[model samples]
Target: AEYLLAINCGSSSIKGKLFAIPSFELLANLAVTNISSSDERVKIKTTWEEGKGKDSEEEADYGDKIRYASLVPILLDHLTNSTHVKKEEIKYVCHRVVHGGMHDKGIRVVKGHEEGLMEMDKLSEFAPLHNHRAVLAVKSCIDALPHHTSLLLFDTIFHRTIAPEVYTYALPPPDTELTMPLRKYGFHGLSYASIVQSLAEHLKKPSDQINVVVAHLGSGSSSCCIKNGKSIDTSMGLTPLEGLLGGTRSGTIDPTAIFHHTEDAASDANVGDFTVSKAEIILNKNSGFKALAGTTNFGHIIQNLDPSKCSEEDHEKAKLTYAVFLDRLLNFVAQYLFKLLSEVPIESIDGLVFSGGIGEKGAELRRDVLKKLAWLGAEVDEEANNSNSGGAVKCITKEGSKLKGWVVETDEEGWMARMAKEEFGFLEHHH
Candidate 1:
């Protein structure tokens, strides 16, 4: 029997998903550190007699020092001995590389050779969180599933084809030999691709020349302006932290803001010291939703929001945060629109759509932002907006609404799996 084990390692968690490829359905998905980090102790949803039967969950504690390295032995034991499949049966070990660049792009087949190790080193800058841990996970998983092929599916691989106009920056080009091409190359490409794939089925319109604002809201959030079927522009730049105020991310703040502070704080603040490095540190670490909302917890805001009695002060802070988030997003979307509407002469933006978390459900926030964008000939369909269900893709525009508004559902991992299968010719030749 052959298997594809996908190891998705996040900043604080480890997920091991065992699957049969091509079909891409869930066979067994184990999420370690869902709530807490794995420090030698772990839990499993055990069923079907590995001494545990009929949905009995087993928990084991390794006291304290179970780093990812330490957890590898345990994870291997679970994948091999826990299920009916023995260790040698597994054929492919798929590692989900959350983010990467041209230097480390695509679905890679790892042979554990010197080149394989070197490629891992090159991929680190793009996905600092995952690339380093991927090296660790690969070593551990290979210890148990040694003979199997190791494959890496980059979260960033889907948007590689973004044309130079959309991908390249407006500023002067960088030193070519010293640095590779850098541009607006969007993140969450897989999610947007999935949404684009479903456009015909859901929207009942051909997707070839349609305009869309795809917000891939999550811890790793970014918004893409999809013109026709391709991403013309995106909020995220060379890094994931470039756009959208995610849980702990500040999103696109003026780079000068950092220099202003660093200059005041540190005397010798050079470009690397404050401007360049500080841009990333402040943008990703300290400003937007996380800083304004005080707590990164969504429930905290939802629970505290009261139109009349809500803390007026908290509301101000939240609105300011929301404003920066929406303004940058709208600016990019408008930028895309002007290009399509004027520059690209591509097609008319007949509609404005939303997706991801806040995009789909934050009706009030959307109204505030869209109202400000009235110059674009967009108006809120209050009735439709109120009546909309954000669980799936649904039009939030009323009859005769000038600019259509849609709420789309995002499937990040599912998109990744399908893209993985597609790139590998899963169904490409079946027909």
Candidate 2:
């Protein structure tokens, strides 16, 4: 049987998914967590079903010394063997390359390791956390699955539709002699595409006709302004660190703040040797909730945010973090709404979609955000929001609400699978 394998390797985890072509039936879903740690042993979890009852296995002690490059082969072996899938069965491999770095399209068909691998090397400078690791995965996979066709699907491609006016920076044109061009090439393209597709299906509307404001809230989060199906503007700028107060990233800080902190060592003794690199590390690593509450876990904040459930002091701190996040998110959402409303009729706005880790499952957080959007006629029914938390896709908007609110669980892998089919011309003759 021919299979399409998808490998998504991120900073903290690596996921391998196998799907049957033509039918797009999921065969195996495997993942390894705790990748970027030396203190704890990595864990591999495999769940597969192929006419032989559903089964799952959890394996620990893969060794803490294992890095992303070394873990690729190990995870691949475990996945294929545990699921009884042969290496030769995988005809195509889809890799989620985070930064396409100014590609007009999101998907690229890589003939071999030469061209695609070289491109990723240059793109790595733009996305240090994602594209470099993707290059590693591609090299390792090329060695492991030599005969299989490979594709690089980018997370930045969906924002290619963003107009020049929205994506262009106010600064002068980049120095072409120094580097590749850069602008507000947004991240989370695949996630936003999946959310938009799923949301359209749930609403029984045509994909091209729907207008949406999507909040893909997660550890690395961004908000996208989708007008009639294409991204017009997004929260993330040239790098993923630019938008939405993420778990660790301090988003959209005043550019002059870096100048204020990183004073010249000779000019100011108090500033020390703080450089732009140090500023990047500080904002991308040491800021956000980690700076505010000493924890990066959104669950911790959610658990403690409720005054009725936690101590007053703890509740205050938790609320501060959540409120700050909401404040930033609301500002972006309002910006998009106002911009879109200016162009189109108010009735033309489809609905507000919440996806990603936080947006999909956080019922209380969703309610809080929707309440703040009440002025825009987005009224969330408390009962629906609370009960809708466990479903596939749900409408939390109360009856007679002007604009609707939906919590749609995103499917990035599924979107990749479908896009692969569409790109390869299998959609017309999948039978």
Candidate 3:
């Protein structure tokens, strides 16, 4: 059977989904996690649709040293061995690229059609943790899948509709040449676009008419103020590091703080084969909750918040970490909400949406956030807030609440697949 593969390469993990072509029905889920972490073993898992293929999970010994390109071949081998699909039958592969400066749409590339790949590599400095890795994954797929087309779906595409006033930075021209403008090009466009589509489908409304503020919390987090189905503003600027706190990101710190923190903030630091500024290495890899609470896992922080579960000092540290995260999150959420309210009535607004790993599972965090929004007429349904029964688009707010709250399971890979289908003109033929 002809198939389409969607690959999402994150800073510390890779997620992918395989779908039957034309039908687009999901066939399997593939993932590699705990990458670049010395304390944990790298996990590779694939679970196929029941009865369609075998499911397996195994650990790799590479630990922190595994390269992103090296895993694609392994994943592809495992995928073919465990599933009914073959490498050549995969017609298209869509990659989730985090930073595509100024490009408003997905770029199509195939074997030997590699000019675009070089341009993407240039964006590595902007998205230090993502672009280069995704480029590597794309190149690997091109080599492994003999007869397939690849589409680079960037996270910046959805934010293309952001207003110039909101996207522009106040800083002066840089001393050195730059590939793109020094302004906000928010990441996570694929996830936000998917959330908008899911929420619209769940509400029985058109995607273009959906208006909401979304907090996509995860290992890397950002918030977008989506109005009438378009991104008007977002927390992330220039790069993902400018937004909300990520697992290892400092997020919106003072511009010169790094200069004081590092001896040569502007000097190059080599990460593997990639060269990035020391400031970039410090803020994007050595900070955030990991620097604060000593763990990159948000769940661990929440778990340690209970005094009885850990020492008082540890609990206090966790408490502070949680509070700091929440504070930064609220600053963006509230401002975005207010931005939406300024023009549209609260009735027209869809609600506040929480997505990504942390947003989907952090029940306590969700409850507390909605409670703080109580002043804005957001009344959280206690049971609903704590339950995952509603599936992808669950409402945690009461029926009559002026401001609604929702938990949406983001499908970036699925979104990338949708874009691929559109780009390949499969939608017209299928429909």
Candidate 4:
């Protein structure tokens, strides 16, 4: 068994996991949030050794104003002290990189290559909210573990293989005076890939043969349809905020909303007008479970549930929120899935899958989504669904329940490490 330290750093969050790479078994998971936030503090929640409750937590508020840079020092101290593992034991460091622009060719194991980080540095201006923070985490990791390998995993790599047709938008052809639509780098590939792989494993079938729609709901929710394991289409556009109605993001807002809202969008480099910005804020912020319920916490939303309970408005809004979310997922499923099913056998079309935090945990939600696809003869076996067999679950669809339905609990970090191990071919670089 080999130990791999998976260091995932986002703009406002830093998540690190020390794991045994070979089996994809998690050793330690740590999350650092509120870094540089007005909260003026940081949180480090550590769970170790097969994911038992944390023996302890390292929570620290600001002293001398805790900035992102200061969090690095705090992270190292907490990790070392909490796990009782020295810095030297961390053989490899893997990061979830948010920007590859169009330049990322494939996964490259860090073998004295600085070009990857350099490329990210250049692209930081395009993705200000994430690229720079990713660069910082990479820098901090390098400083902390000078001898360890620092590998960068691209979120777009999995979709790099998508066909040209689906990746392209409806933009009219550029005049001979300008550049053509040279590229469309798909986003949320890591999440989409995670869902597809989980489904493929559960189905025990080849990827290209299955028709699947994956809804990865969270702060930023997006849907992707997979035909035989390749990404044929997805809801998210070239950017994260383009897709579903997420926490505060306005999903699929009116272009008129932007033009009418302000002229700044016509000139501003980063964002256009208040409408565009607000739509995104809606998509990334005010939408999804948050929009209707005023909170994005799925557990909270469900925890307040009652099939036998009161006010119609309370449950009515939930029904609408879930409907909107399901409609988005199923609309793509109906639109693109029929394309695959029309060509491939129905059995070749694997049952639908629900992964990610929202998809996996919400069993009733899965049934709710599947119920809308009755055209395909989908049914929910409440008995089997309640029993819900396996960590890689097979939901309550019967033997003849048209297609299958699954609630595969996603192991993002485990999947991330497996990805690094697979993409890099461990033996090639291992000492």
Q: Say which candidate scores most in TM-score.
A: 3
Arranged by lDDT with the best first, the candidates are: 3, 2, 4, 1
* Candidate 3 residue-wise lDDT, 1-431, digit = tens: 79998998876788999888988888888998888788898888988887756888978866677766788887888777766678989899998888999998888877776576667667666565568888888888888985798888999999999888898889899998888999988988999999999999999989999999999998889999998899999999888899788889999999989999999889988767777788898998899988998898999999998889888888988999999999999999989999999999998899999998999989889888888998889998988988658688899899999998999998888888888878988767442
**Local accuracy of candidate 1 as per-residue lDDT tens digits, 1-431:** 55566666655566665566545665665655532334544665433323322343445564244565656567667656556666676666667675657633454545566676566655654445336676667667666666776666665666776677667767676555422455654567656777776664576778675566665655566767677676767777777767667777866667566777554542332532113344455556565667887866443454456545468887666656656666666776666566666644322454566766666667766676568657665778887676754446677665555556677786545555555565566766553
**Which regions in candidate 3 have their CA more than 4 angstroms from the true location?**
37-41, 429-431
> lDDT values of the candidates?
0.61, 0.77, 0.87, 0.65
lDDT (tens digit, per residue) of candidate 2 on 1-431: 78888878877888877788766788777788888676777888777775732565555564456756777787778766766678888788888888787776544545464665666666765555547777778777778877877777888889989888888888777656533556788989988888887777777887787798888898888888898888999999888889897889888888778667665412423321222356666677778888876678887899897688777887888989988988998898888888888898767887778888888768888898888878878788888888734666788889878778888787777677777777666867543
Q: Which ten residues in a row have the lowest lDDT in candidate 2?
A: 265-274
lDDT of 1 at 327: 69
Stretch of 10 with least lDDT, candidate 1: 266-275
Cα error, candidate 2, residue 139 (Å): 1.2
RMSD of each: 5.3, 3.9, 1.9, 4.6
Clashes of each: 2, 0, 0, 22
Q: Please, what are the lDDT tens digits per residue for candidate 4 over residues 1-431?
A: 34687766764578877776565567777788776566556777777774533556777884335656556657877877776667777777777776565644433434366775556555554554545565666677777777767767766666666677767767776565421143456566777777777667666765555577667766666666677677776676666666567655656666567566545444533442122343333345444566686666665566446634435665666666666766766776676667667777667677677776777677777777778877788888787676646677566687787777777665556667877776657647555
| Residue 187 local lDDT, model 1 | 69
What's model 1's lDDT at 121? 57
Q: Any runs in candidate 4 off by more than 4 Å, and if so which?
A: 1-3, 10-13, 21-25, 33-41, 50-54, 62-65, 103-114, 172-184, 205-211, 261-263, 266-283, 286-292, 299-319, 386-390, 427-431
Please give the range of 10 consecutive residues that has the lowest summed lDDT in model 4: 272-281
* Rank order (by TM-score, best first): 3, 2, 4, 1
